Copies of this chain bind each other. A is one copy, B any other.
């Protein structure tokens, strides 16, 4: 399985960030990547179910999801994803990384 799954130009990345943030320009962005890639939708379901979280995109081909909301909501969603995948699906996990 040797594949480039994404080779993409974001032509207007500032516009793209405001589009993901929506009305709350004080928001944070959460990003998850995982394998097998098709399980991205389960991360998107967990994040998208939180009251102040919006999904920006889900990509089952690259295995990625991006979402936004207030920082506490985004951190809690990421923790919920790590916990579900580890405890319910036997996935190995990384630390919750912050920038």
List residues of A whose CB falls within 8 A of some B CB.
Answer: 1-14, 16-18, 20-21, 25, 27-36, 61-64, 68, 71, 74-75, 78, 81-82, 85-86, 89-99
Give which listed residue, B1, B6, B13, B34, contacts A4 with CB less than 8 A.
B34
A28 cross-chain contacts in B, Cβ below 8 A: 9-13
Top-8 shortest CB links A-B:
A6-B33, A9-B98, A10-B29, A2-B91, A13-B29, A4-B93, A8-B31, A3-B92
Flag if B20 contacts A13 (CB, 8 Å): yes
Q: How many copies does the complex hold?
A: 2
Q: SS class of chain A's interface: helix, strand, loop or mixed?
A: mixed
A4 cross-chain contacts in B, Cβ below 8 A: 32-34, 81-82, 85-86, 91-94
A-B contact pairs, 27 of them (CB 8 A): A1-B35, A2-B36, A2-B90, A2-B92, A3-B92, A3-B93, A4-B86, A4-B91, A4-B93, A5-B94, A6-B32, A7-B82, A7-B93, A7-B94, A8-B30, A8-B96, A9-B29, A10-B98, A11-B71, A12-B28, A13-B20, A13-B28, A14-B21, A16-B99, A33-B62, A35-B35, A61-B94
